[PDB]
Design an enzyme around this catalytic site. Structure first.
Site, short mmCIF file in Angstrom:
data_model
loop_
_atom_site.label_atom_id
_atom_site.label_comp_id
_atom_site.label_asym_id
_atom_site.label_seq_id
_atom_site.Cartn_x
_atom_site.Cartn_y
_atom_site.Cartn_z
N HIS A 62 -20.83 68.41 -15.14
CA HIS A 62 -20.58 67.34 -13.77
C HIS A 62 -22.14 66.56 -14.17
CE1 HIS A 62 -16.40 69.11 -11.98
NE2 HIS A 62 -17.43 70.20 -12.16
N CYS B 214 -20.06 62.71 -8.61
CA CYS B 214 -20.26 63.05 -9.94
C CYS B 214 -19.24 61.80 -10.72
CB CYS B 214 -19.05 64.21 -10.37
SG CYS B 214 -19.36 64.67 -12.06
N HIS C 129 -16.31 61.84 -13.02
CA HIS C 129 -15.12 62.32 -12.60
C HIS C 129 -15.03 61.40 -11.43
CE1 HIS C 129 -15.75 66.56 -14.66
NE2 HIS C 129 -15.12 65.57 -15.06
N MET D 73 -13.63 63.04 -7.31
CA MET D 73 -15.06 64.18 -6.75
C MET D 73 -15.79 63.50 -6.11
SD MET D 73 -16.37 67.12 -9.47
CE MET D 73 -17.93 67.99 -9.00
CU LIG Z 1 -18.06 66.47 -11.83
#
Ligand SMILES: [Cu+2]
Length: 99
Positions: free
Chosen positions: A37, A84, A87, A92
């Site tokens: 992440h 993120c 993502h 996210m």
């Molecule tokens: Cu992420």
């Protein structure tokens, strides 16, 4: 405030994803599930005159183990959008208000 990266059910979310803090309050982002992440602030979606480089990871940097953290304190008031990078498209994303 602590913010998990990834829900305990492995969902690709910040927990919590929308929250408010006081100035100079620390945010601890901690690798929880579904990593790697990162945390990147949107340069076009933070208070005017804030240097995003001071408060974000590089897009190319990752937290890749359970329990790695990134910490940041914000001082300028206003709304900050973050995501993120790998993502973002998965949803996210989050937003913090410094009030
Ligand atoms: Cu992420």
């Amino acid at each position: 405030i602590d913010v998990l990266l990834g829900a305990d059910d492995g969902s690709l979310a910040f927990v919590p994803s929308e929250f408010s803090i006081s100035p100079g309050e620390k945010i601890v982002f901690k690798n929880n599930a579904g990593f790697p992440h990162n945390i990147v602030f949107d340069e076009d979606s933070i208070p005017s005159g804030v240097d995003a480089s001071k408060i974000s990871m590089s897009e190319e940097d990752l937290l890749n183990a359970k329990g790695e953290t990134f910490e940041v304190a914000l001082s300028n008031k206003g709304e900050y959008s973050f995501y993120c990078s790998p993502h973002q498209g998965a949803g996210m994303v989050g937003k913090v208000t410094v009030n």
